[model samples]
Target: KVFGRCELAAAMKRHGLDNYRGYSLGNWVCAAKFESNFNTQATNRNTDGSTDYGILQINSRWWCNDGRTPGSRNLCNIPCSALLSSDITASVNCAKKIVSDGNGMNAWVAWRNRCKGTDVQAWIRGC
Candidate 1:
């Protein structure tokens, strides 16, 4: 079955992370809930009115500026096809680049940054 954009995004981020960490195919769905409340169709149009959409809440404009097709051509801009395809991991992996802080917990950190204005590093440091 095809994962929603958010689910896929989480999975892809997980892929880059754990895979880099030497972990493989862990409970990504659990990670999704841990990251963004598990709402695949979730959208958070910033107070500034810029739009963020899908399970990963990718900003459409930021994700669509590349020359790829509107669905799956490139990670810089996830075309709609990429968002709709069964290969949802691609989107997540792509989004991870923007979200990752060159560390293993980029997805986890992304959630914290979104909701808490702090990063995993701070949480780890008990700040």
Candidate 2:
């Protein structure tokens, strides 16, 4: 399934992440696999005594709704279906701009190192 910015951002937000959080794209993708099985539309309410949805396995209960049609009433506008769509790259880029001043590749790397594994660091340097 295809994935994009909205899905990536929404997923990051679910895990309380707004920027890269100092990680690598590979690590981020790997984490996504372990968390959501690389399924942008993944949804689990009982994982580790918590609820997570979509790629990055965000917890809708804690984060905003999926962003679909921006400014929509839904807290998370984009739904799993949208994330799984072939146009997911657009969504991922959108989220990168929103959080990292339009740096998708760097954002992914930063997120992998900072948010993934047992390491943690400050968020986006200038963002």
Candidate 3:
């Protein structure tokens, strides 16, 4: 589903990503905006030839089993397609795995550039 900004924010919050670490709801919401613009079906192939999938753009080489990224680790133990699902349960869980397993939300450079040290509260204003 193509989510509205606040819609995705509320949905993510429902999945308990709000304070998974010290990160606020705005932080995660900012990623969705900067990473995929609330697109559950988004995909971006990297320069190193790995693909990112879904709203969080979970990487094929690092977390998901895309079945095509040679030697890719299935750390999240799920297909990359799962990340593209509108339900978002799988995406949310795998997203947390990335945070817990790696450099927290630092895994996505998009966040660092745009949302990291900014006033991300505007991302979820009135919602």
In candidate 1, which residue pairs get closer than 3 Å at backbone N, Cα or C atoms, i.e. clash? Answer: 6-55, 6-56, 9-92, 70-79, 70-80, 71-79, 71-80, 71-81, 71-82, 72-82
Question: lDDT (0-100) at residue 39 of candidate 2?
Answer: 63
Lowest lDDT sum, 10 consecutive residues, model 1, at 118-127
Best candidate per lDDT, number? Answer: 3
Which digits, one per residue and each the tens of the lDDT, describe model 3 over residues 1-127?
Answer: 8899889989999999887877889999999888998889999988766899999999989899888886698899999998999988998999888899758889887998889989988888999
lDDT of 1 by residue, 1-127 (tens): 4355344445555456434443222323334444445555554545443445444545544453323323322336455335433444645655556444354434443454453333322221221
List residue ranges in candidate 3 displaced over 4 A. Answer: none
By TM-score, highest first, what's the ranking? 3, 1, 2
Candidate 2 lDDT over residue span 1-127, tens digit each: 5344345444555544343544433444445545555566665654334344555554333233443323333234344344444334534533443344444333343345545554332221222
TM-score (all chains, Cα) for each model: 0.44, 0.40, 0.95
Best by TM-score: 3
Candidate 3's C-alpha lDDT?
A: 0.89
> What lDDT score is found at residue 9 in candidate 2?
40
Regions of candidate 2 where Cα sits further than 4 Å from its true position? 2-19, 47-51, 66-127
